[PDB]
């Protein structure tokens, strides 16, 4: 692989209604969004079949829950726009149009709540600088002017808050090199100048937050492999030193936490499986990668049920959606083998940084 | 003190809307419910001065944020029956009237958000069995009929969710010990029986989930000091030993979870001060307490603001309502000085069990 | 129990020889020290039988394993001072006679080692203070005068080495509170002021270092349960709260810290069997007490064999020393049953110390 | 750098005395091992200066302290023997003349002490396996025949206590991956097979025990960086996935656990400057690499002092011996600048094991 490649992205966006529920976004045959859901949040449950959207769109789906509940999903237009739309009532199947935010988008859009409820929403522009739009009221159709966060983007965005909520934004740059960029107050404009986290990644940037308080980024590096590093927290502005974990990865990775606290990732491995990894303990050393039965075609995109089991979403070879899920709640539960969401095809819609 | 007693509990009860803009209701001098909130959720928030709910209470209330993000409140009426009010849109100061859940209602109620998005109401009733009663769909005012859980009960309920889902119970019993009770599968009517956790307790029992997703339950012991103990989690059904804390205590406890992912633990103390704990590393030991300056007349409500910045609400020797906060979001923030928020004073509703 | 009790003592001091084999020091009917030991360092392995030392003494025996392999005894005599016997070769049983160190004692001897080889040690003098006197020489026949720590004792000392090399040294106060002393700089003779821990032991108090090199220190308490404190560490010079275990317990505790490196304690319950309680994880909470079959006489002395397997030793209602242990390596190991090491009977020479 | 590279080793060989004075063996351009030591155990000692012992040697020396605290050191000799000298006495310069142990050898001798107080010695021998001899009683001079641990290797091996007793070595092999091999009880003569932990490393493997009883190897990887595994620990047979850390090294590692509990690791960087790495927490991420001044020409030797601070020796571009130190035991204490242990020079005696 090149150090400039961007590694196979998942091919749904994934939300937890207001009652929980799982719903997933993807793109079909037709490049229309469509979408599906959980009937009830229980480990049995039905899913309602595929629902689509009017609408001709231009990158990946990205979709959120508002401070109130309504889900709410962004992606690029045939105008190279930003465009919205939402359920007008929490857990309900009655959406709105697309909607216009307008600006130029060059890059998937990624989508943040900030710590006062309000959604702000992150892309590449035209000039390959960050820029980002917000609700000005929490949960309300009033959207900020664009606004320009400067720098050189070669990936997607991914924002996190950090746990005294001012939210940071992590992307590639022209160097290949994890950059990031953060709100120096809570929920305020006030912004930091770009830094550089080094090495050189070769995917999308993945973050969460550990039970500390510390975010950890996970990335394909140059070498193929998954690599990781965490703030070092407390009073410190500083970073640890990166780590890469051995077994070559060829998606992007996603990680989660598990209802024990620990971080868990997910990838898929050279042999073009699923591939899980998790922290045996506390902060701790990392397992070896265990593999999942069944040649996959997507990055996996991993979800959490209502009652915390893991449920991971790919698209097979059929170019349907597949998943697979933690049948009880412990960390030591047993895995189902892959089944079909069956009723339409997936492209895999993300916008070409190139 | 009698291994009976109960401490003297909060004079409000708290909650973060939608934006996370603290919200406070407490009872005045006309035996009503009034609330108070920040504007904004800023450090220097103004508040905006307490308004009035019509209607007599006999109870102290207790609020909730739904899963759609608004409050709702439920209390005594002057019938004995359980009432609640809402906003009708979270966020905003637009309330229903004061509406029956009926029953026969002996404590003060205590209200938890299943994992599924339900909100669910505990209380004592005619026959001093714990009862309950649930929203049948997520966020809406359809309403479950009442149930019984059985048991004697001596002291308020207090309810909190398990880690994967299932809401769990804890009531002091007809012995003085703090007994439990849990749903067996979660947000499902699937209750186990009720256990003894041994001990006896003077207080309410308080209860905080770890990082890790164990439970852990804070009450005043027998000898007047504050005491401990947690689930033992992964696969177990057992929890530790108990620990008792140096240091006498004269209300109710109230835990909090730091930033940080630690524990902390406020009382009023021996000398009738605020008094606060710690713990000074991962599940470790405590600190010993540290005092804040001031008489206070009332066991601590303790919140956290948007950016994670503890606050303290406490009745003063006034009757009104007095707060303190964190300066900023470090574990090490300096704290203010007590504040009033004044306009009316309050009065301690609080169910006489006996 | 009064708050001026001292809590019955082990029967026994107990050391690993340089070859790890376990080896006891008790005192018979005959008001003289004998001891016995493991043949080999095995889980197996037979006991030498009881070796007598002539001599008639006045205080328990206490053992420390000099740094060049030796084991050296320390007891009173019958003119009151203290009185000392080694190994002349390490792991063989050829000893020297009992040899004067003079002085006048009132306590039971407890000898520690500098980080540097040198023992040191430490007892109540003629006029209840804290004294002391050290090899000059590591591991050499060569003492020091003795010198006095000043105080007012009214238990036994316990002494044990910070991580830093410092000794520091815990016993009861008149006020019968826990204090402590320590050297401020690493084997050298500069030691701090008296300083109190506060709190009323009624028992000697025991000590322990963590992994995370903090001292632990645990005692019996006025409400006749277990408690304990412990550094809070890193640059401090504080402390935390005490905190007490639920169960009463009628002996001395003995702490140990396990292959695992995590803490445990034993003691003799309220039922006078052999009780004992882990932290559950690292720092945890700790464990209901669990219970061994059997009444015994002494608080245990507890030991690890060269596998880090735990042994517990303790008089039996036949006044002989019986001992049990772990039967493999695991901190979830089964545990044989009380089993006699014949031949001799034991009394408490413990002196009064009122 | 190649697959089979071995970076460049440590020029002396460090123990502590039954004292804890630091004393350190190398060998000099008339291929004789010299050794030096701290005249105290003090912050500010003065070193005695270099003393010779005669014999020409064609390895570097091993030294270990035996379990009576006689200092043993081993060695190869003109006749590619292994042979030993001792002290006399514990912490004595009155050393024997090098005696011989015989055999054929053709690396490097590591030396570890048994848990049951016996010396043991492991050497690649004249058929490339891995062989052993020992002493056949503690601390005396009875040896064992030799015996054959089969195997192939391609460094030197380098042996470790688990905590339960049972030796583990480790050593690079024909594929040049790291494989292992172990006592299956403790201090016996019950071998596991050799099985392989994947990877390859291109340094000698160094181990280290954590806190919680689990061995941590480190190595240098194919890519010239430095790389970690460790034991998942409680009853488990297996091992974490392997991780790098960034930052070319060019020197092995030398790992050391410091007062705190925490892994520190130190190696020559890219420039050939020492540079150290530590982990920031608990199990924690590691720190990036900090510099110290000064090109080096060996790999650091790391020992900690009475007190616990670090002490590092390396090889200068005079060819002498240079140490620095933490001047406080803190984990934050300052450093000081290399310092010259004058009076010889030192080459590398390390057997060319191609
Ligand atoms: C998502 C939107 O879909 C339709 O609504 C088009 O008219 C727009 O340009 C945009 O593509
Ligand atoms: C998202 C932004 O869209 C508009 O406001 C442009 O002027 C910017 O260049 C950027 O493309
Ligand atoms: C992800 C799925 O894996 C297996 O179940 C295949 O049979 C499917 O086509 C799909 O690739
Ligand atoms: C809270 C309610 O307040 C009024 O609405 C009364 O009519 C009810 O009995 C109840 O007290
Ligand atoms: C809350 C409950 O109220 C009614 O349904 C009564 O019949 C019960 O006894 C209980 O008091
Ligand atoms: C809690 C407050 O504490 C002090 O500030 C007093 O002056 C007030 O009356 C009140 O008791
Ligand atoms: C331990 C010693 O034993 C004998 O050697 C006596 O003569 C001494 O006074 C002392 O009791
Ligand atoms: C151990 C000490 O013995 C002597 O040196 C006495 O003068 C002291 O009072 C103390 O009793
Ligand atoms: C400690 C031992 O416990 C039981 O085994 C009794 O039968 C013995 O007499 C002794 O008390
Ligand atoms: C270390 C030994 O040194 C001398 O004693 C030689 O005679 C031996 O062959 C060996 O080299
Ligand atoms: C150390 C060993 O030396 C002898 O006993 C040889 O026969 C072996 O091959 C090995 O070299
Ligand atoms: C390790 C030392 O580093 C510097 O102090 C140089 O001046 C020395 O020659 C030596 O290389």
Redesign the interface.
């Known amino acids: 692989i090149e150090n400039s490649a961007i590694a196979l992205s998942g091919i749904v966006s994934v939300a937890n209604?207001?009652?929980?529920r799982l719903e997933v976004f993807g793109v079909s045959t037709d490049s229309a969004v469509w979408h599906n859901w959980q009937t009830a949040?229980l480990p049995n449950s039905s899913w309602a079949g595929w629902n689509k959207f009017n609408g001709v769109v231009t990158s990946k789906p990205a979709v959120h829950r508002n401070?109130?509940?309504?889900l709410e999903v962004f992606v690029r237009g045939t105008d190279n726009a930003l465009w919205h739309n939402w359920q007008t009532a929490?857990?309900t199947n009655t959406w709105s149009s697309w909607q216009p935010l307008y600006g130029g988008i060059t890059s998937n859009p990624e989508v943040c709540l900030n710590?006062?409820?309000?959604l702000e929403v992150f892309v590449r522009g035209s000039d390959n600088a960050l820029w980002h739009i917000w609700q000005t009221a929490?949960?309300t159709n009033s959207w900020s002017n664009w606004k320009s966060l400067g720098g050189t983007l070669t990936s997607n965005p991914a924002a996190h808050l950090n746990?005294?909520?001012?939210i940071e934004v992590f992307a590639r740059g022209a160097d290949n090199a994890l950059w990031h960029i953060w709100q120096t107050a809570?929920?305020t404009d006030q912004w930091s100048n770009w830094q550089s986290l080094?090495?050189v990644i070769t995917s999308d940037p993945v973050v969460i937050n550990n039970?500390?308080?510390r975010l950890e980024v996970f990335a394909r590096g140059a070498?193929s492999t998954l690599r990781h590093?965490?703030q070092?927290?407390?009073?410190s502005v500083?970073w640890?030193?990166?780590?890469?974990?051995?077994?070559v990865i060829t998606s992007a990775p996603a990680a989660v936490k598990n209802?024990?606290?620990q971080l868990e990732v997910f990838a898929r491995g050279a042999d073009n499986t699923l591939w899980r990894?998790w922290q045996?303990?506390?902060?701790?050393?990392?397992?070896?990668?265990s593999s999942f039965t069944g040649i996959i075609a997507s990055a996996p995109t991993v979800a959490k049920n209502?009652?915390?089991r893991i449920e991971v979403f790919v698209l097979g070879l059929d170019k349907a959606l597949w998943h697979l899920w933690q049948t009880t709640?412990?960390?030591?539960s047993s895995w189902t083998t892959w089944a079909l969401i069956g009723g339409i095809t997936l492209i895999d819609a993300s916008v070409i940084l190139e």
Do not use: E, V, Y
């Open positions: 209604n207001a009652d929980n949040p401070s109130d509940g309504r929490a857990d710590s006062d409820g309000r929490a949960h746990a005294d909520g001012r809570a929920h080094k090495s039970c500390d308080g070498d590093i965490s070092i927290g407390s009073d500083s640890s030193n990166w780590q890469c974990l051995d077994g209802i024990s606290g990894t045996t303990s506390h902060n701790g050393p990392w397992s070896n990668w209502s009652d915390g709640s412990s960390t030591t």
